[PDB]
Design a protein around this ligand. Structure first.
Ligand SMILES: *[C@@H]1O[C@H](CO)[C@@H](O[C@@H]2O[C@H](CO)[C@@H](O)[C@H](O)[C@H]2NC(C)=O)[C@H](O)[C@H]1NC(C)=O
Ligand SMILES: *[C@@H]1O[C@H](CO)[C@@H](O[C@@H]2O[C@H](CO)[C@@H](O)[C@H](O)[C@H]2NC(C)=O)[C@H](O)[C@H]1NC(C)=O
Ligand SMILES: *[C@@H]1O[C@H](CO)[C@@H](O[C@@H]2O[C@H](CO)[C@@H](O)[C@H](O)[C@H]2NC(C)=O)[C@H](O)[C@H]1NC(C)=O
Ligand SMILES: *[C@@H]1O[C@H](CO)[C@@H](O)[C@H](O)[C@H]1NC(C)=O
Ligand SMILES: *[C@@H]1O[C@H](CO)[C@@H](O)[C@H](O)[C@H]1NC(C)=O
Ligand SMILES: *[C@@H]1O[C@H](CO)[C@@H](O)[C@H](O)[C@H]1NC(C)=O
Ligand SMILES: *[C@@H]1O[C@H](CO)[C@@H](O)[C@H](O)[C@H]1NC(C)=O
Ligand SMILES: *[C@@H]1O[C@H](CO)[C@@H](O)[C@H](O)[C@H]1NC(C)=O
Ligand SMILES: *[C@@H]1O[C@H](CO)[C@@H](O)[C@H](O)[C@H]1NC(C)=O
Lengths: 38, 59, 115, 320, 99, 121, 50
């Protein structure tokens, strides 16, 4: 019964994080993905 | 076996408290929609490559 | 952390791994006490500008003092929207604005200041 | 695409023939003008050092810098109230609208104030737009409150209905409205009788035009972009100025309290001097840009006052 | 007013002469409840020092500091700090120290 | 292209953003002054093909389809108009052969129609 | 040394921008006058003297 596991890697990419009324991070934009997010 | 890292991989960059405010910071993150590796057996050894995102679902 | 202000109990819900926060632009808002683990906000004690109202130099040496946008609860006494004005006598009837103060109120007549 | 400039028509020009109108449409037009800004005021000695005697001790070596900056800001906040006084307060006294309203069929009910509250349009206007301060920065209140300005504008347009250009020269003279409009027609170059013969059509077009404006404003967003711009610029200048406090300016730390709390006076004063130079330069930049914007507003207010003088208290002859 | 306006006569009107604030009272201090000192003697009172090419290093944490004994006494032949005033060392709380 | 200089620039904060914004505001204002001066007419009127304006000679004022009008060419022959690093110049929104079409419309209107052209139909 | 060069060049640039803003304001005033002249003298017949 082999189960699955995913693996990714990190990179130094500036993010803009959206905080809510509870001080919780609920969204983010990756400032180098595409011209729009840029 | 690749996969779409849609948006996961966001984390709290520091122990400081903010609310109802947008803040832009630079740090190590997982690029959006990047590919991920899928394993299901054969468990090889894996480079750590300056940080590692791991996810799974109880072996 | 060494500063000044007023500490009050914080309803702003922290998370188990936060010591203090900032609402905007490095303005620290709260802090958790390193003993009781309680979070208290630091609201700086009131301050502001003080202005003087005079009829001049020869007409009189009396003067009224206006504390801009301060509720006169700290150090006659009459409250406006410009702030709390102390030393002027309030009247009911209206006149042509002589010495402008703010928010429609202006100020000497019958040997004393009038607002 | 390459932009088109406009519809291409060619008037058929000869020498024996003329085109003449055989009808007319009265219409209305909205023209928006800013005349003020927020009376910003900042305490320099608190902005740079604040609750630190030693810092101000070093600040004293730059003389009157704070005094000049404070004075300049006072001189602009003062002329903003001057601008408002010059544009609105041009009426000798406060006229009142007569209670029985029979202005020849012209329905002015959406322009005049309703004691229930300002006029309907004024309220719509205020609700169209969406008008911080924590360390030595403040905003002074205006001299003339909203209800006081709406009292000047009620006196103004309650005069020009009852007396026309007259009330703007000497004593008001009551003249029936329809006669006044007929005269104004003569003032353009159309024989008086045209107004009387077509009075009903004119009143109808006027009313349906006021209603069209009411709805254009009630639904079309970005109606007041010109007015919104000033607010955005003021907010932007304040937010950038506040943000600059976190800059290091080549110091070991952006916070005065920590450097001071852990360094002997020699090195501490050096790091403080670096911080001061930076913060002072930022303040000088702010005040310069604020002065330029103030000058531009002053010019705008002067234009608005001129337009009011010739178009509201009288009848303009100059075209466009 | 006379003082700010630099004149022995001040005409009619309104003049701003100064700011004001309410001064702080009754100083308070809240340090963590932990109460125990580090083995500072173990750092200086030992002969098992490492060679330069193999320089050793340890960590100092979870304890009460106080280095006035090391600062003022002649125990050290050289005592120089970089960006920190030694006379404030006892009043400065840190996360960790590497020796 | 200096990494160390850049590092020594971040310490100064938002200076460059502010300066850039200022030059953008002026450049937009420059495009607006021309939109606000020449674009006063909604249509592009054209001079009638036959020219019998009661004897008044207009040939040196009007455009000459050989190319602008004669006078304009003369004007463009009387003035004495690069970038290397960090500095640039943007083109205007309205080109020369577009402005000369606003002038040749307002001037072909005032002639045929008098002042009514810009009042209504 | 780099800090010295940076401060100097930054100040020279800020001076340039300030002068450009003032000049631009004067040009704006000129353009407004030009617009008025086109509106009143070309699209009609001004009566005001001179
Ligand atoms: C006055 O008469 C002229 C002469 O026909 C009219 O001009 C033309 O209108 C027709 C359509 O009715 C077009 O096909 C022509 O191209 C127009 N221009 C010419 C002939 O040069 C003109 O429209 C008439 N005036 C009005 C108000 O209709
Ligand atoms: C001038 O234009 C107006 C535009 O409204 C004409 O008024 C219309 O006249 C028609 C025909 O009688 C009516 O059906 C409409 O109800 C009128 N419109 C309005 C808003 O009342 C007017 O008739 C035109 N002048 C002439 C002489 O025909
Ligand atoms: C002037 O026009 C207004 C329309 O705004 C009239 O007010 C309305 O009258 C209708 C008819 O019963 C009511 O249904 C509306 O509620 C009224 N108010 C509004 C805001 O529409 C007003 O009666 C007209 N007066 C005159 C003298 O013509
Ligand atoms: C978060 O704040 C919202 C109000 O914005 C409130 O309704 C909610 O209870 C808070 N807590 C949560 C979502 O856990
Ligand atoms: C602090 O610790 C002491 C004993 O070490 C204990 O008596 C006291 O209750 C503690 N206080 C808190 C807030 O943990
Ligand atoms: C002040 O008042 C006195 C008398 O009330 C008058 O003589 C004088 O001219 C006034 N002005 C001054 C002293 O500047
Ligand atoms: C001022 O203080 C009084 C009493 O402390 C309070 O009732 C009032 O709401 C405060 N604010 C103003 C603007 O008066
Ligand atoms: C002002 O009016 C209020 C309300 O009627 C009244 O209580 C007060 O005595 C009046 N004061 C003066 C000086 O007229
Ligand atoms: C070393 O030991 C001596 C003898 O007890 C003691 O006085 C001294 O304080 C010790 N050194 C340190 C750094 O504690």
């Amino acid at each position: 019964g082999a189960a699955a596991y995913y693996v990714g890697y990190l990179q130094p990419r500036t993010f803009l994080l959206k905080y809510n009324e509870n001080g919780t991070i609920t969204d983010a934009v990756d400032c180098a993905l595409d011209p729009l997010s840029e | 076996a690749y996969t779409n890292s849609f948006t996961r991989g966001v984390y709290y960059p520091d122990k400081v408290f903010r609310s109802s405010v947008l803040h832009s910071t630079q740090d190590l993150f997982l690029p959006f929609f990047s590919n991920v590796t899928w394993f299901h057996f054969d468990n090889p050894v894996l480079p750590f490559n300056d940080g590692v995102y791991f996810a799974s679902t109880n072996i | 952390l060494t500063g000044t202000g007023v500490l009050t109990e914080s309803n702003k819900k922290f998370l188990p791994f936060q010591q203090f926060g900032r609402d905007i632009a490095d303005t620290t808002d709260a802090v958790r006490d390193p003993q009781t683990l309680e979070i208290l906000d630091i609201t700086p004690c009131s301050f502001g500008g003080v202005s003087v109202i005079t009829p001049g130099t020869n007409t009189s040496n009396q003067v009224a003092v206006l504390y801009q946008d301060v509720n006169c609860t700290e150090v006659n006494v009459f409250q406006t929207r410009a702030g709390c004005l102390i030393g002027a006598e309030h009247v009911n009837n209206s006149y042509e604005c002589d010495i402008p103060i703010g928010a429609g109120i202006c100020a000497v007549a019958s040997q004393s200041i009038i607002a | 695409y390459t932009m088109s400039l406009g519809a291409e028509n060619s008037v058929a020009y000869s020498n024996n023939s003329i085109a003449i109108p055989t009808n007319f449409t009265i219409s209305v037009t909205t023209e928006i003008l800013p005349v003020s800004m927020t009376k910003t005021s900042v305490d320099c000695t608190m902005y740079i050092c604040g609750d630190s005697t030693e810092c101000s001790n070093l600040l004293l070596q730059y003389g009157s810098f704070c005094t000049q900056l404070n004075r300049a800001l006072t001189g602009i906040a003062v002329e903003q109230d001057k601008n408002t006084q010059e544009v609105f307060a041009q009426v000798k006294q406060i006229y009142k609208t007569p209670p029985i309203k029979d202005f020849g069929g012209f329905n002015f009910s959406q322009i005049l104030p309703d004691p229930s509250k300002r006029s309907f349009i004024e309220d719509l206007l205020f609700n169209k737009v969406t008008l911080q301060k924590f360390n030595g920065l403040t905003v002074l209140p205006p001299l003339l409150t909203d209800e006081m300005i709406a009292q000047y504008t009620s006196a103004l347009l309650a005069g020009t209905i009852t007396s026309g250009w007259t009330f703007g020269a000497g004593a008001a003279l009551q003249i029936p409205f329809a006669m006044q409009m007929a005269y104004r027609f003569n003032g353009i170059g159309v024989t008086q009788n045209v107004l009387y013969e077509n009075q009903k059509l004119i009143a109808n077009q006027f009313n349906s035009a006021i209603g069209k404006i009411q709805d254009s404003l009630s639904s079309t967003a970005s109606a007041l972009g010109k007015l919104q711009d000033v607010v955005n610029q003021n907010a932007q200048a304040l937010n950038t100025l506040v943000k600059q406090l976190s800059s290091n300016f080549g110091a070991i730390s952006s916070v005065l309290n920590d450097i001071l709390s852990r360094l002997d006076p020699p090195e501490a004063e050096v790091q403080i001097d670096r911080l001061i130079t930076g913060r002072l330069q930022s303040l000088q930049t702010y005040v310069t840009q604020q002065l330029i914007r103030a000058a531009e507003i002053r010019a705008s207010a002067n234009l608005a006052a001129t337009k009011m003088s010739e178009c509201v208290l009288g009848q303009s002859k100059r075209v466009d | 007013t006379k003082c700010t306006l630099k004149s022995f006569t001040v005409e009619k009107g309104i003049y701003q002469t100064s700011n004001f604030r309410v001064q702080p009272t009754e100083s308070i201090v809240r340090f963590p409840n932990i109460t125990n000192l580090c083995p500072f003697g173990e750092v200086f009172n030992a002969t098992r020092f490492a060679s330069v090419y193999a320089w050793n290093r340890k960590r100092i944490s979870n304890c009460v500091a106080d280095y006035s004994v090391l600062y003022n006494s002649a125990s050290f032949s050289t005592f120089k700090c970089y960006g920190v005033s030694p006379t404030k060392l006892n009043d400065l709380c840190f996360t960790n120290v590497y020796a």
